[PDB]
Amino acid sequence: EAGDSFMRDLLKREEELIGYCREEALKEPAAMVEAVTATVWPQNAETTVDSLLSQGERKLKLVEPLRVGDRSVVFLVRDVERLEDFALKVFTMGAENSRSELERLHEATFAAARLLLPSDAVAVQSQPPFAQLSPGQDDYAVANYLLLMPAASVDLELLFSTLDFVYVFRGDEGILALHILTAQLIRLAANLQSKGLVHGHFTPDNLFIMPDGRLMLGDVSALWKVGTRGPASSVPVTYAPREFLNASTATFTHALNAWQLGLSIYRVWCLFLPFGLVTPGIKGSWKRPSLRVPGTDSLAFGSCTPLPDFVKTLIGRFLNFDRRRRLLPLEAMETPEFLQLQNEISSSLS
Amino acid sequence: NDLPSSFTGYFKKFNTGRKIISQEILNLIELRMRKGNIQLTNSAISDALKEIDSSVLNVAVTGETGSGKSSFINTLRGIGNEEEGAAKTGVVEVTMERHPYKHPNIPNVVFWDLPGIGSTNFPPNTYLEKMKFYEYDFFIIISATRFKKNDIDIAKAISMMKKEFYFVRTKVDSDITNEADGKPQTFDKEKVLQDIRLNCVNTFRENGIAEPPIFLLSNKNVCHYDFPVLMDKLISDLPIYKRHNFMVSLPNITDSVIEKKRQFLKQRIWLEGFAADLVNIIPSLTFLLDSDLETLKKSMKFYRTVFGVDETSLQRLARDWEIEVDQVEAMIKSPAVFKPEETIQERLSRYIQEFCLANGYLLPKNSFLKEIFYLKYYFLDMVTEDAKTLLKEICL
Ligand SMILES: Nc1nc2c(ncn2[C@@H]2O[C@H](COP(=O)(O)OP(=O)(O)O)[C@@H](O)[C@H]2O)c(=O)[nH]1
Numbered sequence: 001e002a003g004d005s006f007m008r009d010l011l012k013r014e015e016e017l018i019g020y021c022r023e024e025a026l027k028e029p030a031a032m033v034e035a036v037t038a039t040v041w042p043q044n045a046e047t048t049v050d051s052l053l054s055q056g057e058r059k060l061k062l063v064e065p066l067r068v069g070d071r072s073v074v075f076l077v078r079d080v081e082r083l084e085d086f087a088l089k090v091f092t093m094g095a096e097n098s099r100s101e102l103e104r105l106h107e108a109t110f111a112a113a114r115l116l117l118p119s120d121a122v123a124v125q126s127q128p129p130f131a132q133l134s135p136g137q138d139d140y141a142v143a144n145y146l147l148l149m150p151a152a153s154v155d156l157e158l159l160f161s162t163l164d165f166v167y168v169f170r171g172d173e174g175i176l177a178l179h180i181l182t183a184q185l186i187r188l189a190a191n192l193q194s195k196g197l198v199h200g201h202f203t204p205d206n207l208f209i210m211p212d213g214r215l216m217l218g219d220v221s222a223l224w225k226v227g228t229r230g231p232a233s234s235v236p237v238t239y240a241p242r243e244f245l246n247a248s249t250a251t252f253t254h255a256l257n258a259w260q261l262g263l264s265i266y267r268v269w270c271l272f273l274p275f276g277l278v279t280p281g282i283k284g285s286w287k288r289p290s291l292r293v294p295g296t297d298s299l300a301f302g303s304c305t306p307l308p309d310f311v312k313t314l315i316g317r318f319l320n321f322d323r324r325r326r327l328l329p330l331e332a333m334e335t336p337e338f339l340q341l342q343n344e345i346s347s348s349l350s
Numbered sequence: 351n352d353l354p355s356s357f358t359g360y361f362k363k364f365n366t367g368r369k370i371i372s373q374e375i376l377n378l379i380e381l382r383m384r385k386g387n388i389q390l391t392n393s394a395i396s397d398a399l400k401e402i403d404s405s406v407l408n409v410a411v412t413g414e415t416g417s418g419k420s421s422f423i424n425t426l427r428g429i430g431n432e433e434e435g436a437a438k439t440g441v442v443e444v445t446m447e448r449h450p451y452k453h454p455n456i457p458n459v460v461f462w463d464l465p466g467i468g469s470t471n472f473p474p475n476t477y478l479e480k481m482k483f484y485e486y487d488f489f490i491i492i493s494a495t496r497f498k499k500n501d502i503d504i505a506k507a508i509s510m511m512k513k514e515f516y517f518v519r520t521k522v523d524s525d526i527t528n529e530a531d532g533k534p535q536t537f538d539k540e541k542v543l544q545d546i547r548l549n550c551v552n553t554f555r556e557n558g559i560a561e562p563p564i565f566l567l568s569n570k571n572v573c574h575y576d577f578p579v580l581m582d583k584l585i586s587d588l589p590i591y592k593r594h595n596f597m598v599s600l601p602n603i604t605d606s607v608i609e610k611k612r613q614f615l616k617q618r619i620w621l622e623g624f625a626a627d628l629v630n631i632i633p634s635l636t637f638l639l640d641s642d643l644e645t646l647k648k649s650m651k652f653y654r655t656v657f658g659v660d661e662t663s664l665q666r667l668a669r670d671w672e673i674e675v676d677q678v679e680a681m682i683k684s685p686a687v688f689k690p691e692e693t694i695q696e697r698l699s700r701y702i703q704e705f706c707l708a709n710g711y712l713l714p715k716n717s718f719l720k721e722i723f724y725l726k727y728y729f730l731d732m733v734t735e736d737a738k739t740l741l742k743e744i745c746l
């Protein structure tokens with residue numbers, strides 16, 4: 001709670017800068033943003049939708065675009081008659097089976113529903129759900145399936161890119177923020193572990209600081225029961241350890257999230273990924289596509305922020321290439337290094 | 351009233367740290383002057399000047415790729431990044447070997463671009479050994495945008511050897527513009543600078559290093575930030591005999607830097623004037639042989655170059671203000687001196703009267719420097735003023 005409130009206040013402090021970088025991030029995909037916006041909101045700021053679940057009819061007012069993903073745009077919207085703001089995720093259709101994939105995503109998400117959960121799923125009125133939405137624009141087909149969720153204050157990917165632009169985390173407060181994020185990441189991963197759960201996408205673009213300062217993990221459809229077998233391709237290649245790159249089908253394990261946890265803590269202190277892995281939107285990044293391509297498999301901290309040794313050690317232990325010897329997050333919290341992290345945070349806060 | 355006293359007394363009029371020679375050398379020259387052996391007096395002055403002229407300065411610059419090492423080196427050399435002889439980025443990181451870059455006008459001032467430690471497979475202590483740490487007069491860690499672990503590991507290693515380094519934070523103009531663009535409702539130029547500075551200070555302390563000299567500057571705008579104070583600190587850390595060469599090589603970025611160059615060069619004129627023999631005739635009643643005129647023209651050209659008002663320097667200014675050189679030349683005095691209605695002979699005669707009216711003959715009654723040396727003092731004042739005049743334009 002103490003750390004949450006500190007993060008909340010820090011977010012408010014950097015609110016204008018985050019907003020600036022958020023807008024900057026939308027310039028490159030402007031054509032996509034405009035085309036998706038024109039599809040979902042072809043008249044003015046409001047569009048009327050029906051819930052696919054029990055929620056009935058809503059009018060969603062566009063406030064502003066928030067973020068672009070590989071095949072999606074996320075908008076800040078308002079349901080005026082409920083007095084509630086939401087993030088709304090809208091999906092583009094490249095694939096011929098985009099429709100069936102989204103139907104599958106819907107079922108997996110809501111069957112499954114620290115975790116950012118959806119609030120509702122809706123479809124534009126007078127048009128079939130999942131099918132391509134009218135009015136169509138040729139460069140960007142949009143599916144009639146809109147996912148409503150609480151809006152994060154910032155995702156870690158955008159935070160890192162913002163810090164790369166101007167490193168506002170200076171002095172003991174910025175350093176403390178790095179400590180708190182490190183501790184939050186570890187506890188989030190530890191919480192999953194405690195429930196025998198594994199997420200395929202424990203990555204900065206799926207890690208969200210909420211308005212109350214809490215760090216949450218998104219996309220409950222990618223949560224697995226530990227030991228479950230699934231498509232290895234569901235793990236982003238730059239966030240996949242070697243054992244997820246050698247097969248069509250992989251076992252989803254606590255070792256996977258130990259690895260991904262190591263990556264994210266490394267990025268907290270370094271901004272780019274380790275091992276020369278390509279990290280879009282960060283200047284210091286090399287171009288290694290994945291670990292299956294040979295490169296620097298040694299863990300290098302030279303171009304990072306000067307991180308404390310207790311953090312270095314924890315990253316090193318999470319990023320053990322041996323899938324049988326990675327430090328798991330619950331175990332990590334019992335280490336002296338985690339104790340030291342907690343005491344640095346406690347001393348600095350009070 | 352005695353000549354050796356007048357000779358030493360001139361130097362006492364300059365503040366400690368502005369003296370071109372040590373007390374020991376001054377004592378030796380004064381001693382020989384008192385003993386009346388002119389030949390040994392000359393040789394003492396000659397030796398001192400030669401020791402000064404042949405002094406070599408080796409300045410190391412380390413830091414991450416893209417931190418502004420080559421830019422920093424070029425700025426101190428008064429060379430644009432795209433001009434000939436400019437240090438270029440990236441190259442040292444490939445060779446993994448230091449590369450020397452000489453100052454164009456004072457070639458005994460040498461800057462060494464060092465590869466970032468991360469471009470090598472050297473741990474800090476090995477990296478310092480391989481880069482020949484002990485051979486440098488100054489070792490400068492350049493850092494931009496954010497402190498890297500490598501920067502602090504190198505610093506910790508140097509502190510472990512109980513040696514010294516300077517920390518230079520580049521691209522502060524970029525951080526300022528970026529925070530101004532990103533947070534206008536709360537942006538404050540002075541606060542951003544202070545917070546960058548304290549972050550540097552705090553980073554060293556937190557890592558067990560006594561805070562080194564720290565300088566926040568911009569290779570893109572020398573008219574502001576810590577460039578002047580950096581220069582002050584570097585020269586102060588040098589033995590006296592190396593000061594002249596470093597000083598005259600410095601970019602002409604403040605009135606203080608310019609004035610300080612004038613002070614050093616005034617002492618050089620005094621030494622040269624005494625080495626040449628004092629005379630017993632007033633300089634308004636002597637004339638210049640062609641050998642003197644030649645020495646004068648070469649003196650003016652050296653001064654103009656030192657102070658950045660030489661032909662090449664003026665041309666560069668002209669392109670950038672987008673004008674004809676004759677518009678730049680017209681703002682100052684030195685370019686017209688040896689140019690075609692009052693003859694050159696009348697003109698130099700007038701300069702003597704003006705100088706000696708304003709300043710006297712600098713010496714006990716009935717003793718004088720040779721006329722050429724009053725002229726050099728006059729030229730030095732003129733070139734100094736010319737440099738301040740143009741700097742006012744540039745830094746604005
Ligand atoms: N705005 C600004 N840019 C700088 C400064 N110093 C260097 N740069 C720029 O940063 C980039 C890298 O600098 P450079 O000297 O070439 O890097 P290095 O030799 O590899 O350390 C170049 O595009 C420079 O123009 C500075 O003080 N301010």
Ligand SMILES: Nc1ncnc2c1ncn2[C@@H]1O[C@H](COP(=O)(O)OP(=O)(O)O)[C@@H](O)[C@H]1O
Nearest residue numbers: 067068069070071072074087150151152155205
């Ligand atoms: N509820 C939310 N609030 C704020 N940003 C979000 C939210 N959900 C997703 N995002 C952001 O929108 C972008 C795309 O989200 P998503 O569709 O989950 O990823 P992708 O499309 O890249 O698979 C990402 O940057 C993500 O961080």
